[PDB]
Amino acid sequence: MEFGFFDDANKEYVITVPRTPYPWINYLGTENFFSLISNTAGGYCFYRDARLRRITRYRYNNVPIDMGGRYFYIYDNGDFWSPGWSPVKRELESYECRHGLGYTKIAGKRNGIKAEVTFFVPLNYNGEVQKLILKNEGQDKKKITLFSFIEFCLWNAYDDMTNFQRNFSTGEVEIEGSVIYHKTEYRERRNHYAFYSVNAKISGFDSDRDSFIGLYNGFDAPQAVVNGKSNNSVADGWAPIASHSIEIELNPGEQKEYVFIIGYVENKDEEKWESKGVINKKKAYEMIEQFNTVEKVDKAFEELKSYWNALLSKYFLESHDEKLNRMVNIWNQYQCMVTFNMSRSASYFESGIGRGMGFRDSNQDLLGFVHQIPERARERLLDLAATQLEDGSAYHQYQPLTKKGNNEIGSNFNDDPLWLILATAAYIKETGDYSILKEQVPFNNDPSKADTMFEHLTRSFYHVVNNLGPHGLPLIGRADWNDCLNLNCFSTVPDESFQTTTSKDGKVAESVMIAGMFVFIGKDYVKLCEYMGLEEEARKAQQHIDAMKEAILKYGYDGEWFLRAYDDFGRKVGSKENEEGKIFIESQGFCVMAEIGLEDGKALKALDSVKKYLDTPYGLVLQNPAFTRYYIEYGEISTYPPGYKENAGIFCHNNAWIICAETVVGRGDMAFDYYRKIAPAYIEDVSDIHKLEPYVYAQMVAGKDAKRHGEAKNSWLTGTAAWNFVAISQWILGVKPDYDGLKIDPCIPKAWDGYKVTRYFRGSTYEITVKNPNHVSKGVAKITVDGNEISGNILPVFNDGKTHKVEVIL
Amino acid sequence: MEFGFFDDANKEYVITVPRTPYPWINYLGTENFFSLISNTAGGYCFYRDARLRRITRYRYNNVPIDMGGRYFYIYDNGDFWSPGWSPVKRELESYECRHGLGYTKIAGKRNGIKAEVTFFVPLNYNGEVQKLILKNEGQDKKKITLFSFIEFCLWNAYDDMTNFQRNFSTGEVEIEGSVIYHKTEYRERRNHYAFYSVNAKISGFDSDRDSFIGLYNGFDAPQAVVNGKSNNSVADGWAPIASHSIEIELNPGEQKEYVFIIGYVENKDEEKWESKGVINKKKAYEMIEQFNTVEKVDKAFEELKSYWNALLSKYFLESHDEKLNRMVNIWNQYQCMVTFNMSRSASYFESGIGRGMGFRDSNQDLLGFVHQIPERARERLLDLAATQLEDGSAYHQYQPLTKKGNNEIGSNFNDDPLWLILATAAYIKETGDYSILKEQVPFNNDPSKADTMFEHLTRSFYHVVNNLGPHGLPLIGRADWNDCLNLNCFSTVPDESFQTTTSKDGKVAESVMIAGMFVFIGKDYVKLCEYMGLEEEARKAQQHIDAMKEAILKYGYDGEWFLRAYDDFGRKVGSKENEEGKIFIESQGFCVMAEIGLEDGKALKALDSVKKYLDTPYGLVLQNPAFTRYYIEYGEISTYPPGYKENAGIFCHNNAWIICAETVVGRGDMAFDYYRKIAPAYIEDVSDIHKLEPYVYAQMVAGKDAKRHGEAKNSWLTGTAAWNFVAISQWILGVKPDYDGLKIDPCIPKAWDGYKVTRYFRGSTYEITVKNPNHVSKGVAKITVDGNEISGNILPVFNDGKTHKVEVIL
Missing domain, CATH: 2.70.98.40 (Glycoside hydrolase, family 65, N-terminal domain)
Structure with missing residues (x-):
């Protein structure tokens, strides 16, 4: 059922019936x-x-x-x-x-x-x-x-x-x-x-x-x-x-x-x-x-x-799919800018009583809105770093109003510092402005203890380097990106928070998701180290990255997919030995973006397992089988009924990671089919089932184990928009910012004859036309810039305020 | 207008129309x-x-x-x-x-x-x-x-x-x-x-x-x-x-x-x-x-x-006034018991989100329900004492659910320790059970630092003695009974508490209300000291009480009424020199109750001024003139529009104290007219103006300076019920529990021919018949118990589970 239509000429959504499934x-x-x-x-x-x-x-x-x-x-x-x-x-x-x-x-x-x-x-x-x-x-x-x-x-x-x-x-x-x-x-x-x-x-x-x-x-x-x-x-x-x-x-x-x-x-x-x-x-x-x-x-x-x-003019796509054009050109960027403006303050599911945003949320939104507002992105990045603690740890909750971190909530979410490195690298790749690395940022909002921003990134790297576990994997601490995987809580009292209450010292429970994130972001950290002229630091960082990759390959692979974590008892989480939660979605995506297992076939096996066990007509579920009872050793994840929220629900936030992994393995058709299942413009005709706004992303969709399978919750305030825009625009369409310029490497469905993207990048406009004469998915055969053939896949930087024509043959 | 009636035989209130001025x-x-x-x-x-x-x-x-x-x-x-x-x-x-x-x-x-x-x-x-x-x-x-x-x-x-x-x-x-x-x-x-x-x-x-x-x-x-x-x-x-x-x-x-x-x-x-x-x-x-x-x-x-x-059977009145009969016999006691059961948790004006009730509120409530449930009152008193701190101070907020004090709110409300002595003395007067004074009570809920209850009373007494000000008057802290008189706050920023934020040390601002409290409540402490056998301690306490009385007479009387306080600058509060708030209500209520100026005419002048400047057809206002702007040196009291809450509103809670003072000066007609203006049964025919329940007391009625003069707020949950019941049953009707027994000393309107009260007291029932042949207000002529004339005005204690006839002639 449908309750309206898209007006692409006027950039509007027209609701023609007052009684929508939800406001x-x-x-x-x-x-x-x-x-x-x-x-x-x-x-x-x-x-x-x-x-x-x-x-x-x-x-x-x-x-x-x-x-x-x-x-x-x-x-x-x-x-x-x-x-x-x-x-x-x-x-x-x-x-x-x-x-x-x-x-x-x-x-x-x-x-x-x-x-x-x-x-x-x-x-x-x-x-x-x-x-x-x-x-x-x-x-x-x-x-x-x-x-x-x-x-x-x-x-x-x-x-x-x-x-x-x-x-x-x-x-x-x-x-x-x-x-x-x-x-x-x-x-x-x-x-x-x-x-x-x-x-x-x-x-x-x-x-x-x-x-x-x-x-x-x-x-x-x-x-x-x-x-x-x-x-x-x-x-x-x-x-x-x-x-x-x-x-x-x-x-x-x-x-x-x-x-x-x-x-x-x-x-x-x-x-x-x-x-x-x-x-x-x-x-x-x-x-x-x-x-x-x-x-x-x-x-x-x-x-x-x-x-x-002017806000939306920086990325324009011209393809045969009007739904894709409307999603990329208008609504994804609009939602990203709205998320920047509003953070997580107020929606119809957020009551407006909260005190701030998430540190990881603030860093991840930048990946979405960096190409529209580079200067505000730079200011936001510099404000985020000033809250970081001296040892590299970060406050879990950021307050953009006061430009401070919430001391009451605290720290020990061990994945937080890496998002700062990821966002800083994204900003530098988008703008080419390395000067941000030489700015004096304070620590804990203390001007007395102020150092360069690259020092903040070094502290973020070595926070993970120092806090390792028995198997050489990062200690999960209070939680990781999955805020409901609390392996140090062991809570029996109904009213204590799962994320702040800890009863274990936290020296046993590990996380391979943070390990994959470390391997993924250490590449950018090593590049930044090499820019600053610190060769020995780059060598040390590469050694640590290689050690973490070896640890993942030795103690992080279940046999047909990547593990999820090790609990405080030292037992595997997300393993085929368990009776429930035999496979999780978060580890596979980040371990495949890090190019772990690409040669032996481990990544392909993990993605095939993800398809086999987690795929539904409405997206990928977080884990399978769903937890049917309470596991005191796991935290809040099993406190939900099956098929809802973190108990085998569909998080479109981590579906973009599977999309990126599918582009990494070179399967563009699978990546685009994964993209279509959750894109608002492709699920409009099923609005009565989706029940939420058919023009913006939602946080979570009910999974297969739920009887409301397909229904969404918590719309408009998501990191889903930024990550899905990144996945569609950089990994599928293949227009990726890079340290030296603009990298062209699409991974598209074979049936596509081609497309073209108009991109404003570093003071110039590029008219990149991609065509697929031999219908393939990945692999660039020729790039010509302004009528002249170039070498490699990085477009030259002009910064002359003109328009250049780029032709790409696959 | 009227929306129902009273069914006295069935003990009900019958509402006959659904569209009532408020639920x-x-x-x-x-x-x-x-x-x-x-x-x-x-x-x-x-x-x-x-x-x-x-x-x-x-x-x-x-x-x-x-x-x-x-x-x-x-x-x-x-x-x-x-x-x-x-x-x-x-x-x-x-x-x-x-x-x-x-x-x-x-x-x-x-x-x-x-x-x-x-x-x-x-x-x-x-x-x-x-x-x-x-x-x-x-x-x-x-x-x-x-x-x-x-x-x-x-x-x-x-x-x-x-x-x-x-x-x-x-x-x-x-x-x-x-x-x-x-x-x-x-x-x-x-x-x-x-x-x-x-x-x-x-x-x-x-x-x-x-x-x-x-x-x-x-x-x-x-x-x-x-x-x-x-x-x-x-x-x-x-x-x-x-x-x-x-x-x-x-x-x-x-x-x-x-x-x-x-x-x-x-x-x-x-x-x-x-x-x-x-x-x-x-x-x-x-x-x-x-x-x-x-x-x-x-x-x-x-x-x-x-x-x-059985709950309401311990005090029965038989008079010529059916409104008084239904107020005393049914609804006052019912409201007192309901306040004991519910504290201040949930009403139609309290959202049920609060974490507890006031420390002074529990002690003041005990004065109303002590005669109905003496055994639970003892436990309540022991818990309240157990929450008290070592130096004699108390937590402002009590939590009856956990039997603890709220540490996040704190202390330094300098009138709080004084209510414990009053409540303990009331319990001992009602039951005659002095054994409560010999119980080991912990300090700050610490069983190691445990001492007797009399030690807790001693610490409460000497907290005031060790916290006097420049004029010898008690140093007000964050506030006194009037929670909106914050003389140490000086707040310029909104959304910060007027009662917990202090920008001043607090060694200058004093309170005349706490001084009258100290004089009034300290005599009970002296009596308890004499009972315990400590004659030197009683002598010292009497010396301190005499010094406090001298300080009140020298620096507490404005010239025609009692001063309210001295602010932080050292200037008078509640003085004819001020342009606003030249007279308050609490100091006159408690300084006359303590019998500070009955011989020189100061108390009569103060009560005449109270009538002349604070009296309205719906009660007595807190202060006059109402504050028309914000006074930073006074706190939250001036943050209300004139005529509402503490800005010249009508609190029946201190109207009860004014009634008690009017009985002290021997003017029973004035006391009863003050009682009638706020009693629910007498204001039922004006329900459409009162707008709240015509069978229970409300916390506050809009004052003469308000456009809604006569309208009430915050019903069903207040100390108004207990204090008004005490005023009507003990000070006006004259049946007062006392050490060694039951004192008879009514102060009634002259026109009354008499009345009868049936009282259950210490395992026996008394049928006290009061007669007024010569129409006077105060002064008993003879008392006969079981047909035999006695000396004094204290009824003998029998504890035989029988009924005795008492005849009182004024």
Whole structure:
């Protein structure tokens, strides 16, 4: 089943039915002001902090779902309805939602009246603008009433949802002209406030929730909208809201335009008041005047369109597959940029109460968004390193707001330091800017103990070098990339965290996943060592890498696939000797990217085993068989019902690693079939089974052992987007950044006749055309740049701001 | 306006209309299983812990209000309704709700079908029983179907409401017979589960919320109830629920009876499973069999009635005023016992996420329920003492579940140690059991550092002595009883606690309230010292008390009332020199109770000033004038809008102290008029203004400076009940427990002709008849016990389990 279609010309997804299998949302905002908006105009907005500066109120896991947001009511002779079909839920003559890049349009018609609302956050503007067109498409003149409604939050979502015993008496509002100001706690210690404004004269207003709606009425039928006029209520505690009411007369064919603004203002502590008890509204006046006409709103809309076009213009693909073109050209890059903007703060599955992102998550997102924003990527990389500890360890949780690491969560996730090396190498390969290696980064945010960034990478390498186990494999510690594989926990108490509670010293449990990661990233570390002129350091690093590879080949291979780990007892994890979890997905991908077992056939056998035991029509499952009971020696992984999350669920994050491994072994058809199973554009026609947004990646899809097999959870906030974009664009399509330039090495399905990619790389544009006369999967036979044959597979660097034609024959 | 009445014979409050100014709730449970239920059958249940063992889900501050609870649907030929009028909100021929002592009965009828449900938690039973009667009062036979519905919670309210990234995949249920078992995370470190059962054959069931209700439907119209059939859905993640569906034939005049049970079962770790993956239901089986017939439910109901009747039987008043009779005899004692059972965990204003109650709160609550449960009060006192620190200070927050103090919040609330002496003295006065003073009590829960209870009282006394200020007054720390008077905070940044953040050393700011406390409570300590045989210690304590009294008289009196405090700068707080807050309420209450200025007229002047500046028709405000801006040197008190909470709001908690002071000065009419303004039974006819439960006390009523003057907040959970009961029963009616016996000293309005009190005291019952031939307020003329005239005003102790007649003439 399908609930809409893609609009590739306008870069939109069009939802044509209000009742999607789940609310499908979109993100507005780029710098400081952010908004989550659903297809029925539900969601909320905040300023830089969904936890500490939330502006509007939203209820998660509500009955009915997605109840609350920017609500417009059209009242007509006792009838009333909503453009988004919610909250009123009366049948509309026509409904449409369009999710674009940073904007959302919602159109609804009933009784000959059509309402179209465009929501977007303009650039360099701490507010969300909603432009409303009200059109009379009937044959008679009409008198209608337009109602606006938002619900304010008390700036602290946890306090707003738990501390009623104080905050039921603190809500304060102001009403001036057509503007309603929310200024709760502005009198004591807050220098900021919010406002809801319209650019036309209003017939009435409302600011008390119990007066606009009523105690025993829901959003579907407020008492004021039912009665056809506002009550002009001034909020005094309880729940502040903002509502305008405008009386409109429309001739047949006549339309009217309105601009609503939700804005945020910060004042200097000295200039906080205009008079005693009256707030300073100068900044609000300027903000409102900035968009007091439709022309200015249109100009800002066009500027935002240009912004997103420039963001997405750096990688363009022209192939025969429209689904692939739409995935690569628009939605993958858009999701990567949105993940950079939002981290893991707020979604419809993340409540916005969290305190930060993951260190590995921050480093892995850069692999996705590096080619779009190199300077912000450099700044983010330098900020991440400053939090690293002196011994090479890292904080598990990073806080981009304060640019610090969470001390309460702590350390001992032993895979974290390698992601910094991987991200730094990716940035250097993308930009060629080696100068980042010579910058003075502090340790633990301490300027006194500051060293070069290459020193940080050295500490990251030798943290793994020093913490080895009985078999020569890295000690897993608290956990590795798989946060639910806790081999040092042994927890029997229901309420203690699986990731922070440890009862074992951690000197026995190992991990071959971290070993494969070490072998994979040590190549980049050795290259960086060779650049800095340290030949002896490079020799030592190569010796350690070779020792780790030998350890993997001796104590890490089960016999037909790579092992997973060794538990604290010293027994194998992910082995055919076990009764459950005989094979895991994480070790195979990273041990095949590291080129381990490529000559003896171990990698091919491991990939064949992955296909045989982990493959489902909806992707690869994490492990097989699923754990049917609780294993105290394994941690949280077995605490899930079979087929869900880490208990044999489908993580599309580590499916990209299997895709990369399949490209490494030279099987492009298998890699592309693996890619297709999880790509949003290829699973749109099965939307009713997927149940989530058909335009973005989700974190986890139910596995074969589940009875909801095929259903997804935790959309829009994933490292899936970055890794899948990397897999499709660099390993399959074969356009890979490299230290000397741009490497061409595709691995594609044999049936493809070819394709072409337009790539902006280091101050120049390359027009790479790949053709497959003899239908093969891998192997480059000739590259010509600007009409001249070159040697090798690395394109020369020009940095002249021109366009060069590249022809590749396989 | 009025929304119900009192049924004094049946000890109930009857609500006759469902649309009440706010949801009015009641508590079921006595020992471990507890439940909150409103007049529309909304609320939730939990086991000993609203935070860590919540069984059913409830949404606070919802739109519409109070959505979620035990919901019964009656479906009849396409129509459907609810006996509680919610959530369907279809008009009923008749509705009634009776809130009783530990039980709630809701009756509703429509289309000739009447449904009556009685909810109560039986004694020694970890479950809530709902007995349902369905009666056909029409003239034709009918074919109906009955639907049950509750929504389960995942046992961790914070995790349930914030951690959807994991818990959307963890929900698990079983269905067997007529029982639905919720066993989320039972496959793991949890050894407990819940169940919903009915004692009849069911036509169908539902356990998935999206299948019973639908994604875009609310509680008002579930899709299964609309269609008239169940879907037989088995929950797999998302939101587990429990729903039975029974098809019923009804003849005219015929009725059917059903018993629904919400139960909680804990298993041993070695007896968790009947078979692989199948839970052990033997305990659930016997629990269900315990109430499989209406007769057993009726027997348990009668037993609970007897339990509460014995609980409230130790203080009986017979006066001419029925409102006073119902306040003293039923509802004050009931609220005190409920506060003991629930502490401050869960209400409709407390979200149930807190970790404990206040240390002073437990001691102050003990003053109300000591005469009902003397044996549990002794254990409570011993635990509270065991939590105390070596230097005499105490933890601010007590955790009755773990019997520990909250270390993360800390200490330095300098009034906290003084309440322990008051509570211990009250217990000794009530019981005469001095042996508590000789028990070895640990310090900081350390059995090695254990000493006697009298040593704990000595440390509490000398904590104040060693922490005096520049004027000889006690050094206020983080705060005193007034938690919002933070004179050491000086906070400029939001989202940082006003009560734990201190930027000043704390050696200048003093408190006149703690000084009056020290003078009032120290005399009991001197009496205990004399009992223990330490005459020199008593002499030293009396010297310190005299010095404190001199300090109060020299640096604590403003000139027409008592000062409140000295701020950190050393200036007066609560002085006529200040432009705002020239008079507070606490210092006058406690300095007159300690009899500091009764001979020079200072106390009378202070009380006259209190009446002149703080009196409103709805009570007494905290301070006047209200603070209109933020005072950084004062803390959170000025962070409230005027007229709300501590910014000139009405707390009945210190209204009780003002009543006691008015009895001290001998003005009984003023004391009783102060009592009437806040007593629930006297403000019932103004319910629409009060907006909260007209049968229990609330924490705070909006003051004269507020627009909502007269509106209440934070009901059902406060120290208001205990202190108001103490004021009415001991200071006004004059029956006061004392060392060596029972003192008679009433202070009553002159117009009263007299009254009778039946008191159970130390193993005997007294029938005290007070007569007022010459209409006076204070001063007894003679007391005759068993027909013989006695000397003094202390009744002799008999301890013979008999009844003695006491005649008191004023």
